[PDB]
Amino acid sequence: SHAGYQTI
Amino acid sequence: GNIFANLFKGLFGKKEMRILMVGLDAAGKTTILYKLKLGEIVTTIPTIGFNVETVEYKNISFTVWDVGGLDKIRPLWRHYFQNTQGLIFVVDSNDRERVNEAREELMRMLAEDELRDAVLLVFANKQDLPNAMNAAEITDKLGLHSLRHRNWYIQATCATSGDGLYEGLDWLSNQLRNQK
Amino acid sequence: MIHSLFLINCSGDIFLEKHWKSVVSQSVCDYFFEAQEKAADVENVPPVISTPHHYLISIYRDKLFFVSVIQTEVPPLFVIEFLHRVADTFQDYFGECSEAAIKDNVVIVYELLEEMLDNGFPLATESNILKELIKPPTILRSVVNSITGSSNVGDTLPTGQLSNIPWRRAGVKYTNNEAYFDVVEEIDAIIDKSGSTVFAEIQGVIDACIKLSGMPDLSLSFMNPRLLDDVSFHPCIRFKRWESERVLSFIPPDGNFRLISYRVSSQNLVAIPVYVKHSISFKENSSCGRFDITIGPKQNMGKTIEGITVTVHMPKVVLNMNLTPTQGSYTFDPVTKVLTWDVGKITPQKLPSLKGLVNLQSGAPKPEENPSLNIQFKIQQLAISGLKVNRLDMYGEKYKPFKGVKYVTKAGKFQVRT
Amino acid sequence: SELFPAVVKNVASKNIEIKKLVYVYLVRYAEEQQDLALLSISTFQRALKDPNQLIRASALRVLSSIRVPIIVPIM
Numbered sequence: 159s160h161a162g163y164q165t166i
Numbered sequence: 167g168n169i170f171a172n173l174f175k176g177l178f179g180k181k182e183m184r185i186l187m188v189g190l191d192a193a194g195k196t197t198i199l200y201k202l203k204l205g206e207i208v209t210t211i212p213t214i215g216f217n218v219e220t221v222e223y224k225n226i227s228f229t230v231w232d233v234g235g236l237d238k239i240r241p242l243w244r245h246y247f248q249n250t251q252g253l254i255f256v257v258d259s260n261d262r263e264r265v266n267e268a269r270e271e272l273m274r275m276l277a278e279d280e281l282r283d284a285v286l287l288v289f290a291n292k293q294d295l296p297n298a299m300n301a302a303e304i305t306d307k308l309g310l311h312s313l314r315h316r317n318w319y320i321q322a323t324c325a326t327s328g329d330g331l332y333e334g335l336d337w338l339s340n341q342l343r344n345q346k
Numbered sequence: 347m348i349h350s351l352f353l354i355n356c357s358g359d360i361f362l363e364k365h366w367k368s369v370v371s372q373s374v375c376d377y378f379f380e381a382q383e384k385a386a387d388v389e390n391v392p393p394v395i396s397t398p399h400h401y402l403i404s405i406y407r408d409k410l411f412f413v414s415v416i417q418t419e420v421p422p423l424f425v426i427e428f429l430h431r432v433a434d435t436f437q438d439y440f441g442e443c444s445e446a447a448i449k450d451n452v453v454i455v456y457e458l459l460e461e462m463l464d465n466g467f468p469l470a471t472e473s474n475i476l477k478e479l480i481k482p483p484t485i486l487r488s489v490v491n492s493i494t495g496s497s498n499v500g501d502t503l504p505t506g507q508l509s510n511i512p513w514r515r516a517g518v519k520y521t522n523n524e525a526y527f528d529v530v531e532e533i534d535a536i537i538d539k540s541g542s543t544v545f546a547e548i549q550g551v552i553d554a555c556i557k558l559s560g561m562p563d564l565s566l567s568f569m570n571p572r573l574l575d576d577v578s579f580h581p582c583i584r585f586k587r588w589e590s591e592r593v594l595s596f597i598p599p600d601g602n603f604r605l606i607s608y609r610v611s612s613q614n615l616v617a618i619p620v621y622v623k624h625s626i627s628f629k630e631n632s633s634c635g636r637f638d639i640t641i642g643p644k645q646n647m648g649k650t651i652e653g654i655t656v657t658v659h660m661p662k663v664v665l666n667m668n669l670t671p672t673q674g675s676y677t678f679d680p681v682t683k684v685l686t687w688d689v690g691k692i693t694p695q696k697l698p699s700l701k702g703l704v705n706l707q708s709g710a711p712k713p714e715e716n717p718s719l720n721i722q723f724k725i726q727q728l729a730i731s732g733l734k735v736n737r738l739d740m741y742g743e744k745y746k747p748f749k750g751v752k753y754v755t756k757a758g759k760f761q762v763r764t
Numbered sequence: 765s766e767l768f769p770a771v772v773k774n775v776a777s778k779n780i781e782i783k784k785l786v787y788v789y790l791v792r793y794a795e796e797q798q799d800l801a802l803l804s805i806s807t808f809q810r811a812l813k814d815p816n817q818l819i820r821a822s823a824l825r826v827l828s829s830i831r832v833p834i835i836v837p838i839m
């Protein structure tokens with residue numbers, strides 16, 4: 159689920 | 167065959183005994199029930215609806231319904247007649263003033279077909295009062311020996327002290343839990 | 347406020363009947379049915395219908411009508427928001443408000459309604475509290491319930507109910523501490539026949555999924571907050587700090603959560619990622635005509651335009667169509683005269699189009715206008731407004747949670763004249 | 765409604781899940797079966813004295829929802 163999100 | 171589930175219950179006592187408790191206002195009915203249920207005296211107000219409690223005694227899971235003695239709900243007792251086994255009638259041992267009413271209503275219930283096969287146990291509560299009627303006097307006022315084709319017995323008691331409340335159950339443990 | 351509630355399927359059937367103040371006759375629904383019959387479409391059915399003794403407030407949603415019955419004066423939006431919220435709750439517990447979901451979970455939804463509405467007044471309204479008052483119908487839980495005799499109804503008022511942070515639960519922990527942010531923008535645009543921009547604005551909204559242990563105090567800030575205006579705020583947000591610091595400080599609620607919404611000022615020209623070339627020929631009383639549409643990229647910011655769909659409502663003169671798509675899929679409904687073209691995505695090597703002839707009703711005259719175009723599309727990894735988040739900070743907790751955010755722009759109310 | 769005298773007997777049940785179901789039933793038909801509904805009164809009265817305020821509140825609500833003129837003094 160963590161895939162696809164921009165690290166912030 | 168595989169009847170263990172019943173044998174299991176039999177190992178500890180499957181016996182239940184559906185008992186309906188009725189009577190008139192201020193007879194001490196609720197008091198009795200809860201002393202048998204809890205043992206302590208719980209502060210309360212007049213019963214308006216009904217209560218129900220289950221008490222195990224001598225391996226018998228006695229279940230008693232406390233249906234109020236209030237005339238406003240009195241006739242509703244009929245809904246609790248079906249499927250009962252024992253019938254508790256609580257008597258205020260010194261209430262001479264309403265004893266005819268108590269007897270009458272008792273007889274009305276005794277005339278009920280759903281209660282036709284029920285066992286009647288009468289509790290002469292408030293035994294500790296100085297002006298309380300004794301068992302004989304009460305018996306006479308109720309005319310219990312005029313009863314016919316009916317298993318009945320009167321037991322004097324005092325819910326305040328629990329005097330003989332267990333005894334009442336003891337009689338029931340041989341009459342409701344009878345040979346069958 | 348509310349006396350009763352009827353759930354009515356678009357079919358005209360009643361599926362869920364509720365009464366709070368008194369029993370309302372089902373015959374009251376005949377006034378709705380009459381109105382439904384008078385309207386040419388469920389969307390055009392009046393939300394407020396007066397009857398001899400009752401006022402009918404209703405919401406059309408997902409093929410269902412939420413028809414409430416009120417006998418006294420109650421502010422319409424109070425009621426509408428409430429009912430709408432109920433439907434949202436059903437989506438939370440059963441994935442979506444559908445008649446199937448209702449008939450399969452009658453007891454549960456019946457119970458939910460009893461907790462949410464008390465004698466016509468709002469009682470259980472906050473999601474996270476409700477989630478604890480009544481456990482969601484997880485099949486695993488139902489197994490446990492059949493095994494242990496456990497209830498779905500709690501016996502302890504959730505502590506958060508009496509806290510200063512009523513929007514969330516207390517004592518909730520995660521081993522996988524994480525928080526997801528989703529910046530979604532929608533382009534609202536009116537394009538004329540010439541391809542000129544008539545009107546455009548950007549509608550944005552930021553959602554989040556919070557799986558952070560305890561009571562973390564989040565602080566969200568932007569690199570360019572000056573582009574935000576007319577921003578709505580969920581009550582959990584410390585508005586004062588938004589005003590004095592321009593910082594979204596708050597302790598968020600658990601799980602699915604909408605944080606804010608905003609508008610991008612018209613002072614900045616809204617980039618339009620898609621252009622349309624078009625031509626539809628209708629010879630008056632002809633047995634046929636011509637259809638030609640081309641979809642292409644415009645201000646796509648170097649990103650891929652995908653999930654593209656074109657929907658057109660044709661006039662009664664149109665009987666059928668002889669069209670050949672370059673990709674995706676051409677279909678046409680001669681019953682309702684609806685033209686639907688699944689475009690897909692745009693590859694610059696060849697732009698997508700749909701072209702051929704139109705089968706018209708001979709003897710029937712040509713339409714005075716061509717039907718407007720309704721076009722859907724999505725661009726991932728792109729906030730068309732250029733909105734960029736500066737920082738996401740957390741206070742009060744010690745762990746270092748996964749922090750992630752996405753930026754995506756989708757078609758909003760995007761319609762083209764022709 | 766014909767099940768009313770049979771349902772009301774379980775108003776005193778200890779199974780909270782059942783309790784909620786019972787309350788629903790009573791709300792739906794107590795206005796009609798006003799005499800039978802009287803049987804549930806003591807249960808509520810006792811519930812109102814319970815240390816669990818969630819329960820007290822629930823009892824309060826249900827009690828108030830019973831549309832029987834007889835119990836007005838009580839309410």
Ligand SMILES: Nc1nc2c(ncn2[C@@H]2O[C@H](COP(=O)(O)OP(=O)(O)OP(=O)(O)O)[C@@H](O)[C@H]2O)c(=O)[nH]1
Pocket residue numbers: 189190191192193194195196197198210211212213214233234235236291292293294295323324325326
């Ligand atoms: N002196 C004395 N008082 C008793 C005795 N048993 C009960 N009482 C009192 O009699 C009063 C009425 O008792 P309840 O148990 O409320 O009577 P009830 O039969 O349940 O009355 P309803 O709820 O109206 O049907 C209370 O004040 C009791 O404390 C007893 O053995 N002796």
Ligand SMILES: [Mg+2]
Pocket residue numbers: 195196197212213232234235
């Ligand atoms: Mg009593």
